[PDB]
Amino acid sequence: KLLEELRWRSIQYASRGERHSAYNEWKKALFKPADVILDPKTANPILLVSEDQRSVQRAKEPQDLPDNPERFNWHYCVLGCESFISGRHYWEVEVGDRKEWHIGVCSKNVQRKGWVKMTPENGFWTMGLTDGNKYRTLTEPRTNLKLPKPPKKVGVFLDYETGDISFYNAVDGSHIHTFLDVSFSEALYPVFRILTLEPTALTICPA
Ligand SMILES: [Mg+2]
């Protein structure tokens, strides 16, 4: 129940204006910083992974790449290089002023060729933004989120043993959403999805 605890901590510390400083303290104390690198071999050919492997953008047209087994050939998705089968981990993602993006984790054994809906039942635990101002969790059905402010930077937190995945506004420390009590039985990868063509990339913050 640690990520449940911290959700409630963030309300408690809001009453004293210490929600940001609390966030920075507990994330460092409790969660190992995943130093997340994007795996170019997994990226849909319409996506571009930066040379430093921290940023992803969309191309106008697909690139000519091999259809190797690890590559998403339909979903506009890319994975981090390493997966987690235990412990507590976190990473922060700069979403900036992008009007569309989805992030979170997925199972190692998600279907990478063709389409299935991105939902927990298919091994995706993600949330994000669409159409400039619609924040949603990619549940079945989709759940609308009401956020007091648009986040520019998002913290993703995995507690594998307890089965919790949390999302925080990493600038002000406010809770966005938690998937509670999931029964993981597979390795989990960080996952990132971009549909739109926009000037701003999606960028992982280094550990
Ligand atoms: Mg497609």
Coordinates of N, CA, C and O and ligand atoms in Angstrom, one line a residue, residues 44 73-76, ligand 1:
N44 N 8.1 1.8 -33.7 CA 7.3 1.7 -35.0 C 8.1 2.6 -36.0 O 8.6 3.6 -35.7
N73 N 4.8 -2.9 -35.2 CA 4.5 -2.6 -36.6 C 3.2 -1.8 -36.9 O 3.0 -1.3 -38.0
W74 N 2.3 -1.7 -35.9 CA 1.1 -1.0 -36.0 C 0.9 0.2 -35.0 O 0.7 1.3 -35.4
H75 N 0.9 -0.2 -33.7 CA 0.9 0.9 -32.7 C 2.1 1.8 -32.9 O 3.3 1.3 -33.1
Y76 N 1.9 3.1 -32.7 CA 3.0 4.1 -32.8 C 3.7 4.1 -31.5 O 3.7 5.2 -30.8
Ligands
MG1 MG -0.8 2.1 -37.5

